[PDB]
Design a binder for this molecule. Structure first.
Ligand SMILES: O=C(O)CCc1c[nH]c2ccccc12
Ligand SMILES: O=C(O)CCc1c[nH]c2ccccc12
Ligand SMILES: O=C(O)CCc1c[nH]c2ccccc12
Ligand SMILES: O=C(O)CCc1c[nH]c2ccccc12
Ligand SMILES: O=C(O)CCc1c[nH]c2ccccc12
Ligand SMILES: O=C(O)CCc1c[nH]c2ccccc12
Lengths: 152, 152, 152, 152, 152, 152
């Protein structure tokens, strides 16, 4: 039984994130989205991920605390899957990947997000949305709905 | 009628900035320096840019608020011009450039600052100036004057 | 009168190139595509660029020889416009940009290609096309037609 | 049934490669090492990979021709797994990864090699070995044996 | 008489730092570790560096204030030696190196830390140690001892 | 007795190279410029380095063959000093630096060339000089003289 953990704050989840979830879900038996304790509270973040991943029956959403590698090992896996996008601090991701292999033997697999979703990030989406800009093509509809409510 | 916006906080403007202003002014009909709301207050920042750009008759200085692309489109342009220097977070600039094209159709043109001004930044100039170091060859004289006054 | 030169081998021109041509054409009075002396011969390359740029009335195609900056200065301009894509050797582009400013005072403006065209290059398109892969969504139809003929 | 292809020339295979093979083999049901048509001939390359991977029962070695994505799809998989090391041209790997997703829907997962094997590459190992240097701690013993024979 | 300054906050010193100290100590007549004013207080930081460098008789530990280049010049040297690791912001280090040469004529020499210590940093070690992870193989024993005490 | 080797092809030596030689010569007891076996023949390359370094009495020029680390160790040193400029393939330099430490225990120190000489390289200088461009401000006069002769 193989399994990947996709860790993050997901505040909010973007279509870049969902693209990675989909690719992980297609290559591993189970995928766990670990929401790592912002604009939205924990329960909203969970809801937004769930609502955006109903098409992925082997995907599961869970709150995580502490080291990602602890979460991974407790849940019975040894793989982390993370996306790459424009603006990713890859050097820091690499540093963490090597540290995570060192302390817990967990591998990290990096996958590039699709070009169309390669420039969205949670932070930039929020900042642009707060200043009036339309990022709805870059976020799941469950997120757009909640984003709209707050702006109103 | 073509036009470029050069956006930034300009706290203070450096000769790296002025180098870019000069290159934009030579290639576009109008250049607008948008001061985006630090050490110097808004009026000082404006004054320092104006005083340092008297040799650029098609350049105009204006305070901006909100999204740069909104500023650009309201002022009747669709081009942003930004400089590159050592320490520029280019991946983040790229992310913003793609986001800005997405939401408003605005293009961003990047130009490398001259080598002699390639290692000055507003932040580093301030920090070095506060700790006693001489950065006067890297800043316009209007900035040096104001910088000197505060240190005294 | 402002003018940009877009230099390259264009063997063949891609939709990444055309994206840059379009953005240059919208910001400068004249754009000259300089085809710098492969799979297609010079006349085919010229034809493919012309056929792919009929919607750009201020764009002009010309063969170039020697230094780009010489071409730029002889044609009455001082700006080069180049695109950035995934796999661009940007450090080398920067080196050339600084060298070109040094020897001839010519500025180079870099613009990111649209995400959807950010992973095509002339070389990779050819290599993929030769090994059977379908890159037709990444190239102008004038190029696809000629590409098809040779493969047959 | 999940499966990863690890493509390359493997001329010769290094312990950096074997590190990646091991991590792929632990996360996928099947791993296929595709030797993509140098110093060693095809049969030696195959032999060296086989001899260095006897501890990986779900790993299989095969010669490949043409597009990696064709190989992947014909063999019934949709994942490529590639390692990262110091000197990897990651921008080009990213370009190929996006092109490969475009033409065939195949995902590419990148994993960092262990630090101790992060500076070996086939090319550098050969060049150093030819000029007298000892790289035996960076290569499998099956490779060292064959490397020694040729130098003698 | 030649001399290198190795500046930093060293909160705490890591084996990556000690690796660089050792390489500097072997190439310069004197090495000064400048602790630049966190988790540990100044006196603990000093103690931890001293205790970890007893094998380096030409190495000296000193608190520093203000510009590194001022410290360097006052102490009778003109060289800074800094390490590189995974996650180093090298572009910012380069910017500072050029600024430091500009204002004070001081050269900065960069050396890569050993691969085995290439993913430790003071910040990441602390964060991992606080969340329960074992980083003891990446830190001097004098640091491990003090780290253990606080966690208990 | 401390010593640095500055290895390269130096075809021809540039003022970027001489800048690095000067900084090495000021920090080490002896500097050996190792010319590693182009446009100029070995004897011209030697002559050009010598003629450009008469102001550096502790600098010595020598032809080298094989591994740089062999040269370094035979000459009684354990340090390599290399410059960084715009267009340097730093990832490959890092790979070689780690390989060189591995096989022979030799450290490599990297130093940034001055901004004014940061965009010259032997290759680009030659190519620009062949196509008519004036790079004389970027090369020693001994090189300019020889460069002029060949062009005539
Ligand atoms: O950076 C992003 O916002 C998108 C990619 C990304 C970062 N961490 C991730 C974790 C899981 C899936 C995707 C990601
Ligand atoms: O980074 C800098 O400080 C100099 C380059 C720079 C950033 N934003 C800019 C906007 C306009 C002109 C120049 C710049
Ligand atoms: O690299 C590419 O193939 C696309 C971007 C590109 C490089 N040189 C260019 C010149 C003009 C317009 C675009 C480009
Ligand atoms: O670059 C290397 O030599 C090691 C990493 C590497 C490149 N392609 C690979 C394919 C499969 C497994 C590992 C790799
Ligand atoms: O980044 C690190 O933590 C290790 C490398 C490093 C940064 N500054 C340094 C100063 C002296 C010696 C080593 C270093
Ligand atoms: O790259 C360059 O041409 C200049 C920097 C450089 C590379 N190798 C070098 C060796 C010694 C001194 C300087 C250098």
């Amino acid at each position: 039984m193989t399994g990947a953990v996709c860790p993050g704050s997901f505040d909010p989840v973007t279509l870049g994130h969902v693209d990675i979830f989909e690719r992980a879900a297609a290559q591993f038996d189970e995928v766990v989205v670990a929401i790592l304790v912002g604009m939205f509270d924990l329960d909203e973040r969970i809801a937004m991920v769930k609502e955006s991943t109903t098409h992925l029956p082997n995907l599961r959403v869970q709150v995580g605390h502490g080291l990602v590698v602890d979460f991974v090992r407790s849940c019975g896996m040894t793989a982390i899957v993370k996306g790459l996008r424009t603006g990713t601090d890859f050097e820091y991701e690499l540093q963490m990947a090597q540290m995570n292999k060192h302390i817990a033997g967990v591998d990290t697999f990096f996958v590039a997000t699709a070009p169309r979703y390669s420039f969205v990030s949670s932070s930039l989406a929020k900042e642009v949305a707060m200043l009036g800009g339309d990022v709805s093509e870059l976020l799941p509809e469950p997120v757009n709905r909640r984003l709209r409510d707050r702006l109103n």
